[PDB]
Swiss-Prot record, chain A:
It is linked to Neurodevelopmental disorder with cerebellar hypoplasia and spasticity: An autosomal recessive neurodevelopmental disorder characterized by global developmental delay, profound intellectual disability, seizures, absent speech, spasticity, facial and limb dysmorphism, and subtle structural brain abnormalities including cerebellar hypoplasia. The keyword Acyltransferase does not apply. The WFEF motif is required for the recruitment of protein phosphatase 2A (PP2A) to transcription pause-release checkpoint. The chain holds residues 333 to 995 of 995 of the full protein. This is Integrator complex subunit 8. Component of the Integrator complex, composed of core subunits INTS1, INTS2, INTS3, INTS4, INTS5, INTS6, INTS7, INTS8, INTS9/RC74, INTS10, INTS11/CPSF3L, INTS12, INTS13, INTS14 and INTS15. The core complex associates with protein phosphatase 2A subunits PPP2CA and PPP2R1A, to form the Integrator-PP2A (INTAC) complex. It comes from Homo sapiens. The gene is INTS8. Component of the integrator complex, a multiprotein complex that terminates RNA polymerase II (Pol II) transcription in the promoter-proximal region of genes.
Swiss-Prot record, chain B:
It is found in: Nucleus; Cytoplasm; Nucleus membrane. It comes from the Eukaryota. Keywords: Acetylation, Cytoplasm, Membrane, Nucleus, Phosphoprotein, Transmembrane, Transmembrane helix. The gene is INTS5. The chain crosses the membrane at residues 152-172, 455-475, 529-549. GO terms for cellular component: cytoplasm; cytosol; INTAC complex; integrator complex; membrane; nuclear membrane; nucleoplasm; nucleus. Component of the integrator complex, a multiprotein complex that terminates RNA polymerase II (Pol II) transcription in the promoter-proximal region of genes. GO terms for biological process: regulation of transcription elongation by RNA polymerase II; RNA polymerase II transcription initiation surveillance; snRNA 3'-end processing; snRNA processing. It is a multi-pass membrane protein. Belongs to the Integrator subunit 5 family. This is Integrator complex subunit 5. Component of the Integrator complex, composed of core subunits INTS1, INTS2, INTS3, INTS4, INTS5, INTS6, INTS7, INTS8, INTS9/RC74, INTS10, INTS11/CPSF3L, INTS12, INTS13, INTS14 and INTS15. The core complex associates with protein phosphatase 2A subunits PPP2CA and PPP2R1A, to form the Integrator-PP2A (INTAC) complex.
UniProtKB/Swiss-Prot annotation, chain C:
This is Integrator complex subunit 2. Component of the integrator complex, a multiprotein complex that terminates RNA polymerase II (Pol II) transcription in the promoter-proximal region of genes. Belongs to the Integrator subunit 2 family. Component of the Integrator complex, composed of core subunits INTS1, INTS2, INTS3, INTS4, INTS5, INTS6, INTS7, INTS8, INTS9/RC74, INTS10, INTS11/CPSF3L, INTS12, INTS13, INTS14 and INTS15. The core complex associates with protein phosphatase 2A subunits PPP2CA and PPP2R1A, to form the Integrator-PP2A (INTAC) complex. It is found in: Nucleus; Nucleus membrane; Cytoplasm. It comes from Homo sapiens (Human).
Swiss-Prot record, chain D:
The gene is INTS1. Component of the Integrator complex, composed of core subunits INTS1, INTS2, INTS3, INTS4, INTS5, INTS6, INTS7, INTS8, INTS9/RC74, INTS10, INTS11/CPSF3L, INTS12, INTS13, INTS14 and INTS15. The core complex associates with protein phosphatase 2A subunits PPP2CA and PPP2R1A, to form the Integrator-PP2A (INTAC) complex. Interacts with ESRRB, ESRRB is not a core component of the Integrator complex and this association is a bridge for the interaction with the multiprotein complex Integrator; attracts the transcriptional machinery. Component of the integrator complex, a multiprotein complex that terminates RNA polymerase II (Pol II) transcription in the promoter-proximal region of genes. It is linked to Neurodevelopmental disorder with cataracts, poor growth, and dysmorphic facies: An autosomal recessive neurodevelopmental disorder characterized by severe global developmental delay with motor impairment, cognitive delays, absent or severely limited speech, dysmorphic features, hypotonia and cataracts. It comes from the Eukaryota. It is found in: Nucleus; Nucleus membrane. This is Integrator complex subunit 1. Belongs to the Integrator subunit 1 family. The chain holds residues 2045 to 2190 of 2190 of the full protein.
Length: 655, 608, 199, 146
């Protein structure tokens, strides 16, 4: 080691594994110094560190001691060299002819357990083929082990080709036509679809095979223009490409949908500009879906060509082309999701704002989003968006906005508004929408329990024509909106707090506690850290206190009362007086660090003759950790660890 | 139905009357298929059954084959046409209720019948407006055993996806609803979970087949993780292991998991880990290990949750034994009252004044398991913890991944909480060694827990593998050192080997704090000579260790992150006394005093 | 067999004698039940000794004792008597027993809760069998005990963690935690109450 | 065929408005003709898990009406009812508890496991189903086992 002849150290260690002459602690110290040297520098020592670690591991195995942490660390990334060297050391150090059954069993078990620890299967087999492994293990147990490691990652072969009783038995023309229709239904490749339809129009006469499946559906806006094609084969081919591509897009089979739509676009370019533009719209919608389902939900930006195509579709104003409003919805959602606020708020033509309500809504959302640091125009845009939404969420003066869908006053229907937001995934936009709907939900009455939100201040505090607003529809809408947003990001603590607040206003306190604890768990890595005060404010803590009181978990109320900036003794003392507690009571006294609460508990149990619980409380007071005149850091740490333990107990209890 | 036995003898008569020309026979066949399609209302399943049995006089069987083919084609046209009112097919309306039996029949894998029954299942699923496709898929998944039978379900999905949508979420929801109710008994439950795991793994086995199918089994199963985690706790071990195999490979939802979902998954996972480690030993732990590794990788919250729950379960009263942890009365009394002597005055009094306590104490016999199985249970647990703690990830083939000091810090803080929750003196800075006389009860508790649970030392060296993390275990190290110092002060033997555990604990302690770079190499090697020393000498050496830690302190700010290897480094030379020369003087004097036995060990304590 | 043996004859003879002694002096019956005896003999003595209807008189006094064992014995004895003599006085004493159980559910600590409720929870099945009017009170008490014990389970780490099971079927039949054991006992007694009332 | 378009609307209903209106229509014609609810059973089964109070309550009422008319098909509702009791959505659990005694008397062979599940979710949850369990148990006992 002084001379750096590390290979000789490895050879001495391998030889010593047979004799056990060297001290174990000496070998461990040598390995530790080698690891220290490797960490300081000299990356060539990584080989040496592994080699001596493997030697020490083999020695410890033969001596019947635990495998080191460094061995498992080095076997996180197994290689050919590591495993073959380990097997070489094992074979050199075993000495089977001399070795006892004890050492043989130890080495056998060690190889068995190293085999279990290999994710890769080639390494398992190459250890299995080793002579030492075969000699030490019985063929039965070796076979069993390789069976287990093979079924760990079992390659499975499955038939993807659908069943087909496709045989000319008999060879009648009707049977041929029917099985061709079956093939057409099953087929998805446009070329084979064209072949099948060519053959079908071959042996038939004006059959109009677009009718072959009732499940082939096309939007009615396109049915008239498609069925107007003159040639029966071309009309049928266009209809089948339409239906199959739309269905594939529905079931997220986007590559096949792309093939079908590309074939249809190629076909209609010959003789139809209207169908060509329809095909262009369908390819644009399909491309949006591909991006949002593929490279989307990961943060990578879309290519500029798709953005330009979206803008081109938005700004085109051809009147003859039959247009589906869903494509415009998806385009506005695409722009909003990818933070194209500048285009929406500046570059949109005015006729699109006047005609399409979704584009107007997108412009409003983008404007109120980008203007948030600047309160001047943000306020104006907030009022505009508020007006638009309250018009959408109001009825014309019995009428219910949900039952009478058409009864709205806004630019479009409330259901349309909901379905548009369900296309939006951008966190800030959803935060804005949720803040607006929470503000709207709060002002129905002078309710004490008002739900909060991130941007509740920018909305106006007044409404013209209050009575027109159907607040039942507002409550339904905000519930769906909260559920959708949590389905987008379940770990958004603000939305979790909004959900908890909703559940609290509805007087279902178990769910409210569930979502409040979830919000706290998000911000603190399951309470391993302190929950931030901005999350667990005094108001949130008071709402959890009321949730616990209403569930008759009164000791939990007493514990939670300590979480406030100023500990609320009034509520704690009132709740501890209760005798219908539905929690563990005295099992929760370990989470009390305030000596005043424990003094009250002792007095209360003495007053009631509950001497056992009184002695538990007195023991709780008598902890030197809880002494009120201790240094403030010790008391803070005691409070913090009790906080963490109590909150994790509540987490386990409520979820 | 009444005409099922007559044909068995009347088939010859039927063929005899079937001498009509080919055109008339074909017209009769068309009329027959139309009639059976448009009329069969109640016993149509029995009709289909005996028809298939007669299809499998060879001419009768061939006629049955052609009729079945024509009927399949006619039903195909009947279901798929005109698109708009729906069309009524009484045959299929009769067959909907027999969907389970039909699924069972095609699952027997005959040479030619199963194809017809499968095609009929596809047609029936398309025909039914509340489509029985999800139900049929669920039946096939819950009943199939071999991949050949699972191919029936894949083929059915392939045939139905061209027309229907949403089959797999509905199938999984129905199957799981049946599972969580009393229905779908554990055989079929385990079959369903195994088949679903097979499909998910097949999908992740990214060949051309999954791409062609476009089923998204993993995506669909990812929606039902809350319905799958409780199955890990299922009493039937087949269900639990099938659930573990499915969850190990099932992708998590696209964005993330809610904290409730994450915690439920982690808790079920660690319970499954310990239960299957107890039951099957290390080989039955791979699925739970993989699931917990993925959960650790999901987010830092998931990492902290899985680490703390894993070690807390390991140190729990249950599962300690896995890791070498510790742990006619009046009639007879009347018999014993038979007076040996007549008594002082003919009246007998009992000899004793009473009984102390509740009589004799029970012996409290101890039990110890195999040491080899303890070693390899510890190996499985420690490999899982290393996988959870390791950074992602030829990249220096002879080297190893770096263990995350944040994961190791999580392990350290939960270790401290488990062992010494009452951390009043929890400063990382070490106090004067006189303070050890104030916290004697705490230190003895720590020492007793280290004695009872040998796993604690393994976890301590795991923590010490990541350098800055062992700083946070300072309270446990201090308490164990104080306990050992008290033991060596109170020791009356002249040799240290008479206290084998305390010698082993002192050696392991000095080795861990050297490996954690809380001690320099010189003071990190004294454990090699502990076994050759008297108790007061080893006590003096450990007091030198305490003095060094007073001077320098196990403070994580002393650790400098080295971006070259991505590891924290404690360089004692910059500390100004890193060699511990005042604390090395005691060690050198101890060597010199026992030079007769510690001469050859002088090389281990050289200055450079 | 448990019925056709010399042991059954001896039990009948002893029951006859004890019937005679209790008739001669009911204070002896009171003293014997304040001393208590193994609960395995409770159905035997209640069925075989007609004098035990007088035990309903001093059961309210026995319940008031500070010893936990005496209260446990009083509860079990009352359950067996209620199975035997279903009378309005029996119903009133059963109501008193359920009220006492609910009262000391909030007086006993965790260890005392385990010790008191493990033997006395099967007795609640008998009160349900004898008195359907007690269904509301007994189910409410069972819900309270189950919620308390679930909280206690959540307090500490557990080897089983019945909170996350949450959906088990009828788990028909070790050194486990007291809290998970008590949770399982609550589940089992609720199952027995339901099965009796549905079969 | 007469209620086939209604059922197609019911299956394809994504918004609360479409589902609510088709459910109200089906409610009307089932009050007129209870026998038709057999054609809707799967769809309304799926709708009892819906996270919308009006839709869920309407689906529950229609399912209970259908089972009242034809008690043989009550067992077909057991997995969805138990799923509703076992759902993570708390409002779904409360709705299922609200309708618990009626379904208990409609099933009566799986009422044991149904009430056991109700007690379990009331126990490890923080709700108090003692009233519903007690009423169901009382009426079922006095109807079935004395």
């Amino acid at each position: 080691l002084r001379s750096g002849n590390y290979q000789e150290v490895i050879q001495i260690f391998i030889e010593d594994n047979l004799t056990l002459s060297l001290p174990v602690q000496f070998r461990q110290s040598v390995l530790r110094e080698l690891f220290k040297k490797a960490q300081q520098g000299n990356e060539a020592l990584d080989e040496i560190c592994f080699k001596v670690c493997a030697c020490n591991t083999v020695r410890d195995i033969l001596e019947g001691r635990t495998i080191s942490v460094q061995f498992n660390q080095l076997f996180l990334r197994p290689n050919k060299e590591k495993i073959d060297f380990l097997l070489e050391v094992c074979s050199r150090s075993v000495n089977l002819e001399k070795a006892s059954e004890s050492l043989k069993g130890n080495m056998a078990a060690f190889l068995k357990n190293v085999c279990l620890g290999l994710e890769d299967l080639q390494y398992v087999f190459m250890i299995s083929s080793h002579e030492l492994f075969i000699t030490l293990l019985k063929d039965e147990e070796r076979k069993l082990l390789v069976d287990q490691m093979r079924k760990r990652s079992p390659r499975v072969n499955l038939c993807i080709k659908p069943v087909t009783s496709f045989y000319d038995i008999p060879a009648s023309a009707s049977v041929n036509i029917g099985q061709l229709e079956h093939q057409l239904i099953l087929s998805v490749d446009p070329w084979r679809i064209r072949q099948i339809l060519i053959e079908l129009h071959g042996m038939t006469s004006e059959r109009q095979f677009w009718t072959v499946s009732n499940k082939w559906e096309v939007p009615s806006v396109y049915s008239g223009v498609i069925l107007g094609i003159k040639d029966n084969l071309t009309r049928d081919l266009v209809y089948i490409l339409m239906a199959k591509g739309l269905h594939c897009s529905t079931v997220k089979d986007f590559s096949h949908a792309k093939q079908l739509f590309a074939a249809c676009l190629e076909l209609v370019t010959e003789f139809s500009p209207k169908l060509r533009q329809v095909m262009l719209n369908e390819m644009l919608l399909l491309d949006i879906h591909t991006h949002e389902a593929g490279t989307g939900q990961a943060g990578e930006r879309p290519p500029s060509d798709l953005i330009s195509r979206v803008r081109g579709y938005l700004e085109m104003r051809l009147p003859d082309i039959p247009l589906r409003q869903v494509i415009a919805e998806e385009c506005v959602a695409f722009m909003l999701n990818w933070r194209e606020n500048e285009y929406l708020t500046l570059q949109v033509p005015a006729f699109l704002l006047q005609s399409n309500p979704y584009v107007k809504l997108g412009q409003l959302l983008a404007a109120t989003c980008k203007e948030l640091p600047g309160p001047k125009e943000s306020r104006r845009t907030a009022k505009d968006l508020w007006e638009v939404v309250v018009q959408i969420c109001s009825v014309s003066s019995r009428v219910s906005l949900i039952k009478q869908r058409e009864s709205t006053l806004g630019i479009m229907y409330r259901s349309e508004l909901l379905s548009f937001i369900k296309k939006l995934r951008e966190p800030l936009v959803l935060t804005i929408i949720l803040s607006l709907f929470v503000k709207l939900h709060n002002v129905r009455e002078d309710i004490v329990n008002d739900i909060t939100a991130e941007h509740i201040s920018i909305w106006p505090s007044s409404i013209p024509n209050l009575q027109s607003v159907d607040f039942e529809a507002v409550a339904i809408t905000v519930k769906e909106l909260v559920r959708y947003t949590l389905s987008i990001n379940p770990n958004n603590h603000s939305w979790l707090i909004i959900q908890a607040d909703i559940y609290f206003a509805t007087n279902q306190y178990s769910a409210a506690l569930h979502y409040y604890l979830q919000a706290g768990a998000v911000c603190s890595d399951f309470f391993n850290k302190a929950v931030p005060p901005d999350v667990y404010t005094d108001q949130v803590i008071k709402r959890m206190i009321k949730c616990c009181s209403l569930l008759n978990c009164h000791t939990q109320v007493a514990i939670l009362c300590q979480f406030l900036r100023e500990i609320d003794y009034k509520t704690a003392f009132k709740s501890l007086q209760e005798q219908n507690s539905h929690d563990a009571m005295d099992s929760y006294y370990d989470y009390i660090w305030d000596v005043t609460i424990l003094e009250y508990l002792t007095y209360l149990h003495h007053k009631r003759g509950e001497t056992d619980k009184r002695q538990i409380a007195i023991k709780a007071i008598g902890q030197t950790e809880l002494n009120a005149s201790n240094p403030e850091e010790v008391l803070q740490l005691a409070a913090q660890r009790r906080k963490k333990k109590f909150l994790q107990a509540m987490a386990k209890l409520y979820f | 139905v009444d005409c099922l036995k007559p044909p068995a003898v009347l088939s010859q008569l039927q063929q005899h009357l079937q001498g009509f020309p080919r055109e008339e026979l074909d017209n009769m066949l068309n009329l027959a298929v139309h009639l059976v399609s448009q009329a069969s209302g109640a016993g149509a399943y029995r009709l289909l059954q005996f028809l298939v049995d007669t299809a499998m006089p060879d001419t009768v069987r061939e006629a049955c084959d052609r009729l079945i083919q024509l009927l399949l084609l006619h039903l195909q046209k009947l279901v798929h046409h005109r698109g708009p009112p729906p069309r009524l097919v009484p045959f299929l309306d009769a067959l909907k209720n027999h969907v389970g039996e039909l699924c069972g029949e095609t699952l027997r894998l005959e040479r030619k019948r199963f194809l017809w029954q499968h095609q009929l299942l596809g047609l029936l699923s398309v025909y039914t407006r509340p489509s029985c496709g999800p139900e049929a898929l669920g039946h096939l998944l819950s009943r199939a055993r071999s991949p050949e039978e699972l191919s029936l379900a894949t083929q059915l999905y392939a045939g139905l996806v061209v027309s229907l949508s949403g089959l797999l979420p509905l199938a999984f929801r129905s199957c799981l609803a049946r599972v969580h109710a009393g229905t779908l008994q554990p055989p079929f439950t385990a079959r369903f979970l195994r088949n679903l795991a097979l499909l998910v793994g097949w999908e992740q086995q990214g060949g051309e087949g999954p791409a062609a199918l476009g089923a998204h089994f993993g995506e669909s199963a990812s929606a039902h993780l809350s319905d799958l985690a409780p199955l890990l706790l299922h009493p039937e071990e087949e269900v639990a292991e099938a659930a573990a195999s499915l969850l190990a490979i099932c992708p998590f939802p696209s964005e993330a998991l809610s904290p409730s979902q994450l915690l439920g998954l982690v808790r079920a996972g660690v319970h499954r880990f310990f239960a299957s480690l107890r039951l099957h030993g290390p080989p039955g732990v791979a699925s739970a290990c993989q699931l917990l590794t993925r959960l650790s990788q999901t987010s830092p919250a998931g990492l902290k949750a899985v680490l703390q729950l894993l070690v807390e379960g390991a140190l729990h009263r249950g599962n300690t034994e896995l890791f070498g942890g510790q742990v006619a009365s009046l009639l007879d009394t009347n018999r014993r009252h038979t007076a040996a002597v007549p008594g002082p005055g003919g009246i007998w009094s009992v000899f004793h004044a009473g009984v102390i306590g509740r009589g004799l104490k029970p012996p409290k016999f101890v039990q110890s398991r195999n040491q080899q199985e303890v070693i390899y249970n510890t190996q499985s647990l420690l490999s899982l913890l290393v996988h959870c703690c390791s950074a992602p990830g030829c990249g220096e083939c002879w080297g190893a991944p770096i263990l995350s000091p944040e994961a190791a810090k999580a392990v350290a803080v939960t270790l401290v909480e488990s062992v010494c929750p009452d951390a009043a003196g929890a400063e990382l800075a070490w106090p004067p060694e006189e303070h050890a006389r104030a916290t004697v009860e705490r230190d003895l508790r720590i020492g007793r827990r280290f004695r009872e649970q040998p796993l604690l030392f393994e976890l301590l060296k795991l923590v010490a593998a990541a350098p800055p993390a062992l700083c946070y275990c300072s309270v446990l190290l201090r308490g164990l050192l104080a306990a050992l110092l008290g033991h060596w002060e109170a020791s009356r033997h002249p040799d240290t080997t008479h206290s084998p555990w305390h010698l082993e604990a002192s050696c392991t302690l000095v080795a861990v704090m050297a490996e954690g770079s809380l001690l320099p190499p010189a003071l990190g090697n004294m454990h090699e000579v502990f076994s050759q020393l008297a108790p007061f000498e080893v006590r003096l050496l450990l007091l030198s260790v305490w003095g060094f830690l007073r001077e320098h302190g196990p403070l994580p700010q002393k650790f400098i992150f080295q971006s070259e290897r991505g590891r924290f480094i404690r360089d004692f030379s910059r500390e100004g006394g890193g060699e511990g020369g005042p604390h090395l003087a005691v060690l050198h004097s101890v060597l010199h005093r026992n030079i007769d036995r510690l001469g050859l060990f002088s090389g281990r304590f050289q200055a450079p | 067999d448990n019925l056709l043996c010399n042991l059954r004859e001896v039990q009948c003879l002893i029951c006859c004698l004890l019937h005679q002694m209790y008739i001669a002096d009911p204070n002896i019956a009171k003293l014997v039940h304040f001393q208590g005896y193994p609960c395995e003999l409770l159905p035997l003595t209640v069925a075989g000794i007609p004098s035990m209807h007088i035990c309903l008189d001093f059961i309210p006094e026995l319940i008031a004792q500070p010893e936990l064992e005496k209260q446990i014995f009083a509860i079990q004895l009352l359950s067996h008597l209620c199975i035997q003599y279903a009378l309005p006085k029996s119903l009133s004493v059963a109501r008193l027993a359920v009220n006492v159980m609910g009262t000391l559910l909030t007086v006993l600590t965790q260890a005392k809760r385990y010790a008191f409720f493990m033997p006395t929870l099967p007795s609640l099945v008998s009160f349900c069998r004898a008195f359907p009017p007690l269904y509301e009170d007994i189910m409410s008490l069972l819900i309270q005990i189950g919620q308390v014990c679930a909280s206690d389970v959540a307090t500490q780490t557990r080897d089983i963690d019945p909170i996350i099971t949450r959906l088990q079927q009828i788990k028909e039949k070790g050194s486990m935690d007291p809290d998970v054991q008590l949770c399982h006992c609550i589940e089992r007694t609720v199952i027995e109450i339901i099965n009796m009332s549905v079969s | 065929a007469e209620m086939a378009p209604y059922m197609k609307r019911l299956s394809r209903g994504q918004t609360v408005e479409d589902l609510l209106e088709v459910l109200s229509d089906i409610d009307e014609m089932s009050r007129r003709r209870p026998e038709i609810l057999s054609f809707f059973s799967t769809n309304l089964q799926r709708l009892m898990s819906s996270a919308e109070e009006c839709c869920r309550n309407l689906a529950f009422s229609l399912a209970l009406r259908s089972m009242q008319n034809s008690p043989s098909i009550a067992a077909a509702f057991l997995p969805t009812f138990m799923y509703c009791l076992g759902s993570q959505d708390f409002e779904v659990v409360q709705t299922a508890l609200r309708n618990l005694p009626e379904y208990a008397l409609l099933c009566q062979e799986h009422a044991a496991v149904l009430l056991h599940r109700a007690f379990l979710v009331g126990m490890y949850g923080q709700m108090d189903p003692s009233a519903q369990i007690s009423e169901a148990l009382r009426i079922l006992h006095m109807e079935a086992v004395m």
